[PDB]
Design a protein around this ligand. Sequence first.
Ligand SMILES: O=c1ccn([C@@H]2O[C@H](COP(=O)(O)OP(=O)(O)O)[C@@H](O)[C@H]2O)c(=O)[nH]1
Length: 303
Amino acid sequence: TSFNEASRTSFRALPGPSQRQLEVYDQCLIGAARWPDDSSKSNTPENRAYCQSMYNSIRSAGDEISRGGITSFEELWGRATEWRLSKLQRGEPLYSAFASERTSDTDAVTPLVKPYKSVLARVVDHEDAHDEIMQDNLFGDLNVKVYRQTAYLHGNVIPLNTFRVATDTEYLRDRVAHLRTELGAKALKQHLQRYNPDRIDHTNASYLPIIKDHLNDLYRQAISSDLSQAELISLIARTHWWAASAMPDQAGSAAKAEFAARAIASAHGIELPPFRNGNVSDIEAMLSGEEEFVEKYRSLLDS
Ligand SMILES: O=c1ccn([C@@H]2O[C@H](COP(=O)(O)OP(=O)(O)O)[C@@H](O)[C@H]2O)c(=O)[nH]1
């Protein structure tokens, strides 16, 4: 019904970011990772500045969306990515990872070491955790609690993230002492970047093309001008879930997914509050099925 000449695309105008804004205290928590075992990083002035910048840029992106200036999820992710890159320090060796999509000839692993240790209990006490045994060229056989996150896409049920937590605590202490003595602390740390017994094995990058296409489909639904509030919050939660669980980039995906979900909300005049202390949104996504995440999304938010 309207036409954006700069993006050369027809769109239905949305209200855009709300005039009533979050309090500054909340602005400075947008995008924070408020771990339950340690929320202290989120109190520093550096982190507060990072978060308030995210908030301001989320609102600017919401304005672009409301005017037809961002026309696909991939473009919104690009905005989030360039914003995230701007916060890296001069010289950052991870700059390329923050700037780059993951590729298939790579596996991606998050060892569940600091700051992720609160996740170990969440896996062990998970309703959907299964007991399994994993074979391992350095540790041998290990009892693990495993959560296998899955997704429904066009009737294909695909594996997303797999959490493994090894439960033989004393045997592990023992076997790591052996490994450290035989290999050195840094070299073993290098091996465990991929094979730490406690870890998340991330969504295979081969799924990223179809997930990226699905995110574009969700975005097209989400910029509709005639959605109910429940429909809209459901679409925002689904977009967040898919983008965070896909983990499309070598670094920074959690920040980019939260940026994008909040920008979609802001385009509709919704000013979403911070995630509650203790709720790290990408981790909550990866630890749930999609419909479960949609049904609890509001409760993850601080009101
Ligand atoms: O100075 C910073 C940088 C990042 N983050 C947040 O910490 C999380 C980091 O996860 P992400 O996947 O974005 O980055 P990566 O784990 O690849 O470094 C995200 O919620 C960021 O918004 C933060 O609170 N402060």
